[PDB]
Each structure stands twice: as C-alpha cells, then as structure tokens.
C-alpha cells in the first residue's frame, strides 16, 4: 500500500503551499523553505528519498505535539505507522544499489538548484554515495544540468498558462 | 503494492465513462451517477476514501454475479483479494488521526459539490468525524470553497482544450 500521510502546514511567508524545515532538522541549523512546486510533487512521486524523509520528520512533529508523553520510550507507534509514511521499497532500492556496487542514497545529504533572482528551488535530490564517500559534482553534473532545464521548462509553462 | 481492481461498467445515460451507485448501496435508496471526470481520478489517487469504498462495493457486485454460491459463508476471498481493492494505509491514516485527536474519516458519509445547471459533480470527499460526531459545515467551508474553485478551473480547462 501507498503512503497516505500528509504534511502539516508549515508555509513560509513568501512560500505558500510549501513546507519549511526548521533548524533542528538540519545540520546547518538554518531555516529552509521549499515552495509548493517542489512540495506538491511529494504527493505524486513514489521514488523520492527526500519526500519520505520529509514525512518522517513531519510525523515526529505531529506525534510529539499531539500525543501525551509515554512511560518509557516505546516504538509501537512507528512499527504500526511506518508504511503510511515512507516507501519501504526505496530502502530496498538503495540497498540493492549498494550490493550491486552502484551509487546509492544513504538518506542524509541532498542537493537542489536555487534560482539567484527568484529564490525558486527544485525538490532536493539525494547526493549519492559510492565506495565509502560522496560522489563528486564532476560525476553527476549532467544530471544537475537536466534539473536546471526541467526548472526552466516549468517556469515557461507557468507564463504560458498565464497567457490563458 | 498498489490496488489493481477496476470498476465494472456502470454508466449512466448522460454519464458515460462514469459509475452509478444503485439504491441498495445507499442509505437514501436513490440512484446516483458520477461522471468520468470524478471517477477517472480513482485510478490516479492513492488517498481517496470514497474510491476505495467504490471498489469494495464493485467487488461484491462482481463476486456475487460471477461466482457460484459457497457452502457456508467464507471470507477467504476477501482475505486474499483485499489489497487489490483498497489502500490499507488509508485505514491506518484515519486510525492515526483518531488517536492523535484529529478529525478522521470513518468511511460512512461523503459530500460533493453539484452544479445546478449542468449536473456536473465533484468526486465525493469524506465528511469527517471528531469527538463522537460529524464536523459542522462551518468547520470546513473553506475546503468546500476550494473544491468549488477546483471545479471551475477544470471546466475552464475543458473549454480551452476545445479552442485547440
């Protein structure tokens, strides 16, 4: 069964429909807001590691704010809730990549493109790992360029829909 | 794994590509026909409680018409067939909502918008339950208004595609 959990409202002031990651969720301890053009895609894609992590973090936020603190730490809640939050077959995908000696996502580091005048960003992609370390940019710059063109295409589609 | 069951043909005369609910499936004992613009969405959405119920009811219709009556009532057929019919993670979603004291769907009541001149309707949304009863309209009228705008948008898209 497909994940069903939805993200809570966490909009930025200039980022309606999006989702903001507060500082405790990030190593950099910065506040990062992604718009709806990136976030909405999490409800369509079944293969994005970032979106599944986004759900696990959102789950924690809601579970801690909504539920009364337990006596002793219990993991029953996640054992029952997990399939509603993540695609377990992505874990399997990355596991198979690892075994088959193919760069794989270990879920900790992501990259995105950020337009320098508008602040519009892509949905973060996982930075891949191979032979104990991260791949260099020089090993995937063609995928980065493709993401840049996908963003340009989307921007043009937006203006065209404005032409009605 | 994602549901695979498809609905049987149950078109209305003016509702091709849709699906009609006969009176025994409804408390009101009325015949209600929904068009293809609502029904087609059930094959794309993973998160609609109405669509999963629509499949369980359709399943029964086909199982009773196609299979020979059993000796004693057995539930082996559903135990094997269920994941092909519904998203079990919606049950989990509503279960978690309930526990976390968030309005949840108990699958019995739905609402939709119906245009007064054309008869075009939205795909029914679940009427939510909180603290033993149904939420009032005054607690979700903004979501209803959003559904009205989504329908207007779709109608305009249709005419625009007519302009070619």
């Amino acid at each position, epitope marked *: 069964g497909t994940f069903t959990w939805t993200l809570s409202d966490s909009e930025g002031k200039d980022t309606p429909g999006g989702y903001c990651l507060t500082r405790w969720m990030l190593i950099e301890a910065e506040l990062k807001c992604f718009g709806n053009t990136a976030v909405a895609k999490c409800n369509e894609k079944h293969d994005e590691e970032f979106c599944d992590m986004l759900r696990l973090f959102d789950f924690n936020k809601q579970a801690i704010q909504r539920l009364k603190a337990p006596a002793q730490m219990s993991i029953q809640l996640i054992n029952k809730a997990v399939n509603a939050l993540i695609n377990d077959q992505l874990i399997m995908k990355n596991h198979l990549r690892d075994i088959m000696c193919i760069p794989y996502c270990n879920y900790s580091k992501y990259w995105y493109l950020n337009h320098t005048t508008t602040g519009r960003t892509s949905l973060p992609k996982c930075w891949l790992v191979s032979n104990g370390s991260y791949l260099n940019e020089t090993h995937f710059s063609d995928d980065i360029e493709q993401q840049a063109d996908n963003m340009i295409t989307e921007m043009l589609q937006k203006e065209y829909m404005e032409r009605q | 794994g994602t549901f695979t069951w498809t609905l049987s043909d149950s078109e209305g005369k003016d509702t091709p590509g849709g699906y009609c609910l006969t009176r025994w499936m409804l408390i009101e004992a009325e015949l209600k026909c929904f068009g293809n613009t609502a029904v087609a969405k059930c094959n794309e959405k993973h998160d609609e409680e109405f669509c999963d119920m629509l499949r369980l009811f359709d399943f029964n219709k086909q199982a009773i018409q196609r299979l020979k009556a059993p000796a004693q009532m057995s539930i082996q057929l559903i135990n094997k067939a269920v994941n092909a019919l519904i998203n079990d993670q919606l049950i989990m979603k509503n279960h978690l909502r309930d526990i976390m004291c968030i*309005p949840y769907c108990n699958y019995s009541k739905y609402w939709y918008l119906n245009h007064t001149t054309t008869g075009r309707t939205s795909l029914p949304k679940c009427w939510l339950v909180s603290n033993g009863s149904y939420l009032n309209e005054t607690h979700f009228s903004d979501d209803i208004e959003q559904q009205a705008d989504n329908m207007i948008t779709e109608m305009l898209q249709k005419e625009y595609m007519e302009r070619q």
Partner: antibody, heavy 119, light 107 residues
C-alpha cells in the same frame, strides 16, 4: 479582586464575549511595568496550547452552554500579579486548522482585568 | 525564542519614526504590531507584516527584510506617542512571543 498565594485564579471574559465558534480565543497578561506575556489559546474545537513555562498551572476552556470563555490558574504565588486580557484571534473554517494553527494574533482585546495577589 | 526591539525611539513631530523587531523564525512567521497607550488594552496597528487594519491611520505602514520586520510611522503626530510591541510565533509555531516593546516618544 485579591488572591492569596495558594489560591486559584478564575477569570471569565463574559463581558467581552467568548466561545464564538470559528475563532481561536486567547489569554494574555501584563505584569505592571512589563511587556506582554502570552498565556495560552483555545481553538473552536476545544484544543489548547499554553505558554510552556506556565502550562502546568493553567487551564483554558470554553463553556458552550454558557458561551463563556474562562481561565483557571493554579498556585497563584504573587508573581502572577498582572492585568489579564482576552483576545479573539483568527478565525478557522478549514479542517487543517481545527485543532492547531501555526499562527494567531490578538486583534480585539477584552479591556483588561487587574489581578492582585498578596497576603 | 525571543524577539528584539529597541527599548525606545524619539521623533520630532512631523518626522518619521521607525521601530524594528528581529528574530530567527521571522522568515517563516508573520509579525503583528500592537499599540498600547497608558491605561488601555493594546490595539493592533499592523496585521501580518505590513497590512493596515481598518481604522488605523495611513501613517502606519509595515515592511520586512527576512529576519527583521519594521513599523514605520510617517508624519508622526502627538497622537502616536505609545508603547509599540511586535509579536510572532516560534519556528515551529505554537508558542507566541511578544517583543520587549518600544517606547515611542513624540518630544
């Protein structure tokens, strides 16, 4: 009026109005000579949030048979001397904000009721 | 979570007063500004970062630059002498914080 250090404070914004559905009502206090401090808020669904440092001593509730909004503060140990106010806040007509809302504000204020705590 | 405001400003009549407010959650949260004159309850002056509520004079206008917000009073009148406060929520929402309050005097 005057409260003793171990007494419970009970205030109702009956005069201003309260328990109006669709709004998130809140309580605020201002110790004399100080800035404003948020106490807590209640959604139309009955859900509440409290200032984390105050939370263990405070209850906010709405009596829907009376249409009255009220605050109960336990162990009012002198430091709680302040002017207490209600504010109406934001409205909500969507499911997503029914039990929690990322934001609120205090638009109309309920005049203010000075509370003296002493012995 | 705290918001920082200067404790006071002073403006000659007819000049422009500016009071600022800062904090880390501000790129996500909206600030609201309130005016309190001695003896009364605060009245909201700026709604969200810049919008002026009905009944508030055109002199009052807000703005923001990311982690800071500000209230500008153009053409300050003696009528505007008051303690002005900002508020915003914490990064995760839920907790609402008022700033220290800026005393604006009209000399």
């Amino acid at each position: 009026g005057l409260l003793k250090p171990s007494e419970t404070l009970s205030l109702t914004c009956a005069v201003y109005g309260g328990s109006i559905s669709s709004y998130y009502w809140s309580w605020i206090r201002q110790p004399p000579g100080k800035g404003l401090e948020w106490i807590g808020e209640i959604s139309h669904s009955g859900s509440t949030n409290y200032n984390p440092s105050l939370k263990s001593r405070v209850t906010i509730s709405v009596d829907t048979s009376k249409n009255q909004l009220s605050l109960k503060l336990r162990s009012v140990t002198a430091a709680d001397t302040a002017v207490y106010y209600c504010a109406r806040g934001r409205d909500c007509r969507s499911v997503s904000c029914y039990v929690s809302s990322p934001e609120n504000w205090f638009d109309p204020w309920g005049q203010g009721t000075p509370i003296t705590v002493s012995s | 979570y705290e918001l920082t405001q200067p404790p006071s400003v002073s403006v000659s009549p007819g000049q422009t007063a500016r009071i600022t407010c800062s904090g880390d959650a501000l790129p996500k949260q909206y600030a609201y500004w309130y005016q309190q004159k001695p003896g009364q309850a605060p009245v909201m002056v700026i709604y969200k970062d810049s919008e002026r509520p009905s009944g508030i004079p055109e002199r009052f206008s807000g703005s923001n630059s990311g982690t800071t917000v500000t209230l500008t009073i153009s053409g300050v009148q003696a009528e505007d002498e008051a303690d002005y406060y900002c508020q915003s929520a914490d990064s995760d929402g839920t907790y609402r914080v008022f700033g220290g309050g800026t005393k604006v005097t009209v000399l």
